[PDB]
């Protein structure tokens, strides 16, 4: 028995774990997401992989969930695991709601859930999750914050970032444009561009994307939505537009 | 359960696997610790400012009590179980010794727990190498430590870990000195700056003080790092 | 290959036993005599750097009032053993009030060393890759036994263990006279451990230790006496 | 048997306990401080068994402090309260701690309040708090004088004529009592009360 | 890889060891057949023993799991005996926890079932046995079932197993392409003569088992050699 | 050879190599010598010091009043297997306060053993044993390979240079069934001697340990055994 | 008993390999396919028999999970009873809780956490299968697929098993939005008839439709032949 | 070619490789012999000293397992007392519960399925001992064999070991039917000595155990003088 055993915790010869860099790279073959930290909000951008004319696309989400009432998700790699790793993230917040009445911060969600990951990651010989998450959400504690997740069990603040495939292109466009103050409509605007221009088409498509933000609305709640196909034809025809607005010189 | 012995003798009595774990440290971001009559500062290379990093809600060097502190270096995943456990550990003395734990107790807990690690079957070394930092209660004699992902460790007058951090003990070997207030500071920074050398956005500090931890402001980093920079051309000029 | 932690090798040794035992070949020169008026301990420290203190490197540690033990090899898992003896030493005590003979702690810390295996009847998977020195006094009087990763032990009067071994257990049997006085006895041992160390023998490169009645580990000036005296 | 109080003033939540620590006839203490210091802004008198007293604060302590190190932001005073009662009310069915707590704490953008943790626990943001037979006359003589907007001078006279009924109408008045105050410079102590 | 010593899929999606299985069923030379009557279900095998010391009364395939079920085992002796047991505890625990006989297809769901967790779970090895069941449904009449390694349980009017499944098929679905509904002595020598017709030999109504269902007397039943003896001697002058 | 590895991997000859890598292990043991009569058991061990300051390593003990053994192979087995005697002997004395037969104390230590060279994860033990003692028939002696089988003779010997030994007692264990106390110690002496390569035989070297009908167990002293090799 | 050890670690490409083999698996089945009506779903499949003397009625690939809710299989047959088994339990504990039939979207999520376990536990093999669940429920008619990855999508027509590509270009030339229940039926049947080789007949496909509100009902071959006629 | 290394994993040839390795251990042994008498069952064991120390009786290879029946074990001998411990636990077990002697056939078959399932396991190194039991029930003298492959059928005479095929061969020209248990101790003594083979390999001890009628249906050694005037009349039968 021991001869099928892959020995998925263990240290090569470099110092660094095999799988989870195996992971990273499943990561890397997904479909991609990006997320913008703005002044007033906080929006994810995200790519639906599996895009046959077939595909219903009247189901709200394939790759943001709603964690709780004031953190999302946006989930790039294995949907399988990530799933489950947003059941088990949505069971911790509420244990922290239970626990101590009151909205669990941003930050220690994303650090039980990479907590979680870690534990494949070190001990019991199954294979870790291949999964890479992105989260938004807002806390008394901090404000609107933005964290990105390794398989590997690691995260960090990020003011915008990318996962999945073509990930370094995004990251590049943001370092190059992203600035402080952006607001609501600015980080969408430069999140459409920024994904477009990371797309191998341009003049997206409606079906072919997913667009959520969680602001504050005026009295003081946290409202997270997911926008709507038309609001989302809405928005990609003012960036189609807008693009040449700037281009033209 | 999964019980496999990771961890195991090569036909030369070395553990690979613990070996491998020291190289997994190499890694990871560069850290320096310089123990001072009055105080105890830690410092590490990156301070999560390449330009677009969200870093208001986490610090390297983190507190496992307001008497102790502790650098990690190496797999940061790691990093957080091995600082959580410890936590615990401090509260947990203190609730069943009112006493709360002394520097060389959590270093040595730490320490075990490491061993335990690198024999139990079925689970992976931790890949880490801590720096830890505190005075002893009652005692106000400060006081520094390091554990490696062998599971030993020792006490320090200064120390790094990390990436080169041969290079950096070379430097504190050689310019290492009974330091107090600023002092201690100052060759921290110098220390750091043998290998980052882009000082100022890449560091963090921390000094230790009797009454707790309290980390440097950008100001106050780039102050210092001014400070050497000058001095030391001024110094090179002198003598050349 | 993927051989098994308990494997037999095809002479009948366990293999992993085999690559614990070369193990200690790289760990400290740990040496110790017997004699009438007690029992000393010595051991390199191995100080690498300046910067190290000396002092917070402990190689000889005590496992009750009577029961010195110098560890060599992997130093990490030397402290689970004294751990473990000493925990045994106490509870020998709290079931009858008397000191645990020395030979019963050394069959005490050896009954733990072959425990190791997969499978879930024991959480150890890999032997100690520690050789120690148990120097002790009892009513049978000054004793002094040694172990290896093979779970064995045995009285002697006179050994060396790690990196040293056979030169230091060679220049024993050449010296070790049986009527060595104290003073005598640890001033071969410190004489023996400065050929084989590297390093200039100073009082912070080594630590000694007295068994005598009572343990007592050298004070770095006390060390400086006995090297001036060699 | 133990009695504590609390009291909310305008920028101040005071509380107030016996410090006499007994056996059975015996006065072994009376310098027993009861009311803990969760953090610089948290006050916890507590009721009861003395060894659950003692344990059950010890433990919420450990966790508020867990809490504190772990994330960088304390834990706001309803928080602490919810947490406490949770802990309470799921050791109620299991091996009952009788403890009676009452938690006050302050924090910037709320101010002073007063949580009512009952051993069944009972978890009630309360204006006024009151355990043990001084809870009787404590809480009596607040409803008279009580108002919300109190000077510290007000509340703590008010303080003092609750421990002088409790002394002369109780039949185990204790002789001793200690009043700590968290405002917004933190929890405190008061004033101790010396009667013998 | 491992994925021939192992019931994980190969890399074009087929499980060796599940088809090793069959080859061990396929092996031990014998080759037994049911056929599915109008009133009964008749199940026949061959038996060989190779010394006079051996005890022919200890050498069978066919199994009692219930006075009211029948089960002919093919492939490993043993593994046909520990599916057997199981069976029969499953059998008992039917009838207890639910209060009624357990019916046919229940059974070979069961076992059905069962062998799939051998496929799935890597260090099991499938059983090498097809266990064919027969038995008389109270409501639905006679049935007649085929559970393999694999876990592939399907219902057939008639079927085969053993070393000799295409040529018996074969027979026995050239001698019913008209549908036909069989009587009891039909159906019984149906399926001795697709036996016959298969091993090219006669045979003494020695080295033959029969074990017989019917309508009339639902007990699975044995046939007496007299009245094997008998169906042959109707085969031979016809 | 690739039938090797694990214990319970049958190789295709019929043989388990594992198993008889622990039955080696035996081989390594110093001589453990062993000859019965029929009242008495005689256990001579011969020592072997792993240097001239260094002391040599026990090999006979006590596991009741009635039983003895001698082992051979790695100690750290040994003290195990004598571990779990001695308590058998023990329960079984708290039981029914009667003397733990030989033979049934020698099988359920054949079983004990034969069970780790059944399962993946265990391992044969790699000791010896060399069980004498007492039964209501007299004395007895067996031998515990760690394969988990158990043999009854008149005499025997195990352990580096038991081969000596062996071919002596063969010429001489058919006067042993009658001999006394005082010949059986003899003849382990004798035995010993054979195995030491031209030395003169001395108390120095081999502890003897005898048990017998009237007698409890008892290692002989050092100076008694070198008075009658004097002899 | 450690068997803790995944069998579907990650290639050095990140692909995991034995769910691709798994995929695979199921590419080698029969062929299966579902259209969802504007006003209803159909599910269809093919039930082609080795032998005549297989009695085909004894066992049927389109099985009800609640009276919402039917499924159909492609690949390996016995892991599809697993499945189906595993689906019913799950459904009626969440009626037992809440005194309501389980919404189509929560039994397919929960099937594929089904799914998914077995491609992380260690000692065994994911499902060679995979499902197309067929529902209608309080917000629509419904068709999920769930596959040995266990991933699930909602599809408005979808095909597996032997023949896919001929019967996914089919069905997407073919397929339009305001399809009626029998329109679906006549589509699905005319799929089937593609590639089947040989002749249709109601005893060689299983078909399953679930009207307006109503139950999730699997055509007899009484009536599937006049649906064909 | 790698297939041949565990219990779970058939070979392409839909067999097992390690079940038949350890029936190969058997098959090296030392004969083992029963035979089911009109009148009982007599079983015989061919035991080889391994070296002329060895104390007549050592090794005993035919041991009971409850009241009315008993065991005679080949191959891996510390199996075999595992799989005789196993048989005890059996007829006791059975014996409490239903408070009746086990039937031989049904003691025969759990301990048969207890010897099939000792190969299921991928951990479980399999059995390599063969055994043959032989009580008298109320149903009469029976005698079974059970195979380290977990197969067994109730047989009237029996053989494993070495002399597998010799000792069946004479079995055969026996009229079972017609011996009392006492001609049964002389033909299988004869049988025995036959079947060794001096020339290649050392000596042996005739072991014998009756299970008749005047052994009171309860399995007992062959007496010993019995025994003796048998051996003496088998070495006679020699030439």
């Given at each position: 028995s021991r001869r099928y055993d892959s020995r998925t915790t263990i240290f090569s010869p470099e110092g660094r774990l095999y799988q989870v860099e195996y992971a990273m790279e499943a990561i890397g073959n997904a479909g991609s997401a990006i997320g913008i930290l703005a002044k007033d909000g906080v929006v994810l951008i995200g790519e639906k992989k599996v895009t046959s004319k077939l595909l219903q696309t009247s189901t709200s989400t394939e790759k943001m969930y709603k964690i709780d009432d004031h953190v999302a998700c946006a989930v790039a790699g294995i949907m399988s695991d990530a799933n489950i790793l947003i059941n088990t993230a949505r069971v911790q917040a509420q244990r922290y709601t239970f626990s101590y009445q009151e909205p669990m911060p941003v930050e220690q969600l994303v650090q039980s859930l990479c907590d979680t990951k870690q534990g494949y990651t070190q001990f019991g010989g199954l294979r870790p999750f291949g999964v890479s998450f992105l989260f938004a959400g807002w806390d008394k504690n901090y404000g609107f914050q933005l964290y990105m997740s390794d398989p590997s069990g690691n995260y960090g603040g990020w003011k915008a970032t990318a996962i999945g495939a073509n990930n370094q292109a995004a990251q590049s466009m943001l370092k190059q444009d992203y600035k402080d103050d952006v607001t609501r409509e600015d980080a969408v605007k430069l999140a459409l561009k920024v994904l477009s221009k990371t797309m191998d088409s341009t003049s997206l498509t409606s079906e072919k994307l997913e667009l959520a933000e969680v602001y504050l609305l005026p009295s003081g709640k946290v409202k997270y939505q997911v926008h709507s196909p038309e609001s989302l034809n809405r928005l990609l025809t003012e960036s189609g537009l807008t693009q040449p607005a700037a281009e033209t010189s | 359960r999964y019980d496999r012995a990771i961890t195991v003798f090569s036909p030369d009595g070395h553990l690979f696997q613990v070996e491998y774990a020291l190289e997994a440290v190499r890694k990871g971001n560069a850290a320096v610790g310089v123990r001072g009559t009055d105080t105890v500062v830690l410092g590490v290379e990156k301070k999560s400012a390449a330009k677009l990093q969200d870093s208001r809600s986490v610090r390297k060097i983190v507190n496992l009590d307001n008497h102790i502190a502790l650098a990690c270096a190496g797999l940061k995943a790691d990093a957080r179980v091995l600082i959580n456990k410890a936590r615990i550990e401090c509260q947990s003395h203190k609730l069943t010794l009112e006493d709360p734990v002394t520097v060389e107790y959590i270093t040595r807990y730490i320490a075990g727990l490491q061993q335990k690690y690198t024999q139990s079957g079925g689970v992976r070394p931790f890949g880490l190498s801590t720096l830890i930092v505190g005075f002893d209660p009652y005692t106000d004699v400060p006081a520094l430590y390091q554990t490696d992902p062998s599971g030993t460790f020792s006490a320090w007058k200064a120390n790094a870990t990390g990436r080169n951090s041969n290079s950096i003990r070379e430097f504190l070997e050689k310019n290492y000195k009974e330091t107090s207030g600023q002092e201690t500071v100052k060759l921290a920074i110098r220390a750091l700056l043998e290998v980052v050398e882009s000082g100022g956005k890449n560091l963090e500090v921390a000094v230790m003080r009797k009454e707790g931890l309290h980390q440097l402001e950008e100001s106050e980093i780039d102050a210092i790092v001014a400070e050497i920079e000058a001095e030391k051309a001024a110094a090179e000029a002198a003598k050349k | 290959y993927d051989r098994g932690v308990n494997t037999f090798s095809p002479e009948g040794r366990l293999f992993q036993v085999e690559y614990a035992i070369e193990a200690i070949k790289l760990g400290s020169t740990a040496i110790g005599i017997k004699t009438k008026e007690g029992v000393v301990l010595a051991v390199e420290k191995r100080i690498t750097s300046p910067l190290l203190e000396p002092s917070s490197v402990e190689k000889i540690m005590e496992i009750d009032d009577h029961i010195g033990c110098a560890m060599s090899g992997l130093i990490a898992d030397a402290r689970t053993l004294v751990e473990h003896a000493r925990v045994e030493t106490q509870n020998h005590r709290f079931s009858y009030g008397e000191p645990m003979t020395v030979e019963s702690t050394t069959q005490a810390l050896c009954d733990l060393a072959l425990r190791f295996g997969e499978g879930?009847?024991?959480?150890?998977?890999?032997?100690?890759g520690v050789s120690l020195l148990i120097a002790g006094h009892d009513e049978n009087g000054p004793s002094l036994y040694y172990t290896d990763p093979s779970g064995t032990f045995w009285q002697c009067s006179a050994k060396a263990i790690g990196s040293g071994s056979e030169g230091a257990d060679s220049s024993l049997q050449e010296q070790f006279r049986k009527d060595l006085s104290f003073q005598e006895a640890e001033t071969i041992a410190l004489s023996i451990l400065k050929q084989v160390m590297e390093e200039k023998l100073t009082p912070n490169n080594v630590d000694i230790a007295k068994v005598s009645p009572t343990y007592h580990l050298y004070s770095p000036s006390e060390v400086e006496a006995v090297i001036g005296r060699l | 048997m133990e009695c504590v109080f609390g009291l909310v003033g305008n920028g101040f939540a005071i509380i107030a306990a016996d410090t006499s620590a007994v056996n059975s006839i015996l006065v072994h203490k009376t310098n027993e401080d009861k009311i803990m210091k969760l953090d610089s802004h948290k006050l916890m008198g507590a009721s009861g068994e003395a060894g659950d007293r003692v344990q059950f604060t010890e433990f919420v302590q450990k966790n508020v402090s867990l809490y504190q190190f772990r994330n960088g932001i304390p834990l706001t005073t309803a928080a602490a309260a919810n947490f406490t009662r949770g802990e309470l009310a799921t050791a109620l069915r299991k091996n009952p701690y009788s403890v009676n707590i009452i938690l006050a704490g302050f924090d910037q953008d709320t101010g002073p309040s007063l949580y009512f943790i009952d051993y069944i626990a009972t978890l009630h943001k309360v204006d006024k708090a009151a355990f043990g037979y001084g809870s009787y006359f404590a809480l009596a003589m607040m409803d008279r004088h009580y108002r919300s907007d109190m000077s510290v001078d007000e509340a703590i006279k008010l303080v003092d004529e609750c421990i002088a009924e409790i002394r002369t109408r109780l039949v185990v008045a204790p002789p001793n009592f200690v009043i700590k105050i968290v405002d917004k410079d933190g929890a405190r102590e008061f004033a101790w009360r010396q009667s013998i | 890889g491992y994925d021939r010593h192992i019931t994980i899929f190969s890399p074009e999606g087929r499980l060796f060891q599940v088809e090793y299985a069959f080859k061990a069923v396929k092996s031990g030379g014998v080759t037994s057949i049911a056929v599915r009557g109008k009133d009964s279900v008749c199940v026949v095998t061959q038996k060989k023993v190779p010394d006079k010391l051996l005890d022919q009364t200890s050498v069978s395939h066919l199994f009692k799991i219930t006075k009211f079920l029948g089960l002919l085992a093919t492939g490993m002796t043993a593994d046909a005996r520990n599916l057997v047991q199981q069976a029969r505890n499953e059998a008992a625990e039917f009838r207890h926890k639910y209060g009624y006989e357990m019916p046919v297809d229940a059974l070979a769901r069961w076992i059905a079932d069962k062998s799939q967790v051998y496929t799935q779970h890597a260090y099991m090895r499938p059983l090498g046995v097809v266990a064919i069941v027969i038995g008389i449904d109270e409501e639905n009449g006679p049935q007649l079932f085929k559970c393999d390694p694999a876990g592939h349980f399907y219902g057939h009017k008639a079927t085969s197993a053993g070393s000799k499944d295409q040529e018996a098929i074969n027979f026995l679905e050239k001698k019913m392409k008209n549908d036909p509904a069989f009587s009891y002595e039909e159906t019984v020598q149906t399926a001795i003569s697709a036996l016959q017709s298969v091993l090219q030999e006669d045979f003494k109504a020695t080295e033959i088992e029969v074990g017989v269902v019917q309508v009339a007397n639902p007990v699975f039943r044995s046939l007496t050699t007299e009245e094997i003896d008998e169906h042959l001697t109707a085969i031979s002058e016809r | 050879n690739q039938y090797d590895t694990d214990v319970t991997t049958w190789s295709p000859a019929g043989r388990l190599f594992q198993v008889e890598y622990a039955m080696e292990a035996v081989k390594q043991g110093s001589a453990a010598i062993g000859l019965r009569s029929k009242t008495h058991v005689v256990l001579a061990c011969v020592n072997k010091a792993q240097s001239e300051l260094s002391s040599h390593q026990r090999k006979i003990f006590k596991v009741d009043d009635h039983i003895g053994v001698a082992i051979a192979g790695l100690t750290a087995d040994g003290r195990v297997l004598s571990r779990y005697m001695r308590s058998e002997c023990i329960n079984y004395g708290f039981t029914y306060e009667s003397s733990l037969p030989v033979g049934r104390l020698v099988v359920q230590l054949a079983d004990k053993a034969q069970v780790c060279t059944q399962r993946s994860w265990k391992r044969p033990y790699g000791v010896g044993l060399l069980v004498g003692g007492l039964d209501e028939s007299g004395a007895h002696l067996y031998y515990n390979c760690p394969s988990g089988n158990y043999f009854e003779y008149q005499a025997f010997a195990i352990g580096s240079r038991s081969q000596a030994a062996k071919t002596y007692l063969e010429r001489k264990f058919d006067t042993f069934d009658g001999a006394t106390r005082d010949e059986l110690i003899k003849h382990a002496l004798f035995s010993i001697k054979e195995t030491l390569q031209g030395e003169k035989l001395t108390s120095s070297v081999c502890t003897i340990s005898v048990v017998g009908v009237g007698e409890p167990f008892q290692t002989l002293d050092q100076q008694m055994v070198q008075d009658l090799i004097n002899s | 008993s450690q068997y803790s050890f995944s069998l579907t670690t990650f290639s050095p490409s990140g692909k995991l390999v034995q769910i691709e083999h798994a995929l695979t698996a199921v590419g080698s089945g029969q062929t299966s396919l579902g259209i969802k009506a504007a006003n209803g779903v159909v599910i269809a499949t093919e039930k082609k028999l080795p032998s005549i003397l297989v009695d085909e009625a004894s066992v049927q690939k389109i099985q009800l999970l609640t009276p919402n809710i039917g499924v159909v299989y492609s690949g390996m047959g016995p892991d599809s009873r697993v499945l189906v088994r595993k689906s019913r339990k799950q459904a009626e504990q969440y009626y037992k809780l809440y005194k309501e039939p389980i919404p189509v979207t929560q039994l397919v999520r929960e099937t594929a956490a089904v799914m998914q376990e077995f491609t992380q536990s260690g000692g065994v093999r994911p499902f060679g299968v995979s499902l197309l669940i067929a529902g209608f429920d309080e917000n629509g008619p419904q068709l999920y697929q769930v596959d040995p990855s266990g991933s699930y999508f909602s599809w408005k027509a979808s095909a597996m098993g032997k023949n896919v590509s001929n019967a996914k270009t089919f069905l997407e030339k073919r397929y339009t939005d305001d399809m009626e229940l029998d329109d679906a039926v006549h589509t699905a049947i005319l799929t089937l008839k593609e590639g089947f080789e040989g002749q249709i007949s109601g005893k060689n496909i299983e078909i399953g439709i679930i009207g307006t509100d109503k139950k999730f009902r699997v055509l007899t071959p009484a009536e599937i032949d006049d649906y064909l006629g | 070619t790698g297939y041949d290394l565990s219990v779970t994993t058939f070979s392409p040839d839909g067999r097992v490789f390690q079940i038949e390795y350890a029936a190969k251990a058997v098959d090296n042994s030392g004969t083992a012999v029963g035979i089911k008498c009109k009148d009982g069952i007599v079983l015989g064991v061919e035991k080889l000293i391994q070296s002329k120390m060895m104390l007549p009786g050592s090794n005993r290879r035919i041991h009971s397992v409850h009241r009315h029946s008993g065991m005679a074990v080949a191959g891996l001998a510390a199996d075999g007392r595992q799989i005789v411990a196993r048989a005890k636990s059996e007829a006791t077990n059975y014996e409490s519960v239903y408070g009746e002697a086990v039937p031989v056939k049904e003691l025969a078959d759990r301990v048969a399925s207890y010897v099939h399932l000792c190969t299921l396991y991928w951990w479980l190194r399999p059995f390599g001992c063969g055994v043959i039991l032989g009580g008298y029930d109320r149903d009469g003298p029976q005698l079974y064999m059970v195979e380290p492959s977990g197969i067994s059928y109730r047989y009237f005479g029996a053989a494993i070991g070495k002399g597998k095929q010799a000792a069946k061969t004479e079995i055969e020209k026996l009229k079972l039917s017609e011996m009392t248990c006492r001609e049964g101790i002389i033909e299988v003594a004869k049988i025995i000595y036959k079947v060794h083979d001096e020339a290649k390999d050392k000596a042996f001890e005739l072991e014998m155990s009756w299970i008749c009628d005047e052994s009171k249906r309860e399995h007992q050694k062959v007496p010993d003088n019995l025994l003796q005037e048998a051996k003496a009349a088998a070495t006679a039968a020699l030439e």
């Open positions: - | - | 879930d009847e024991e959480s150890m998977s890999r032997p100690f | - | - | - | - | -």
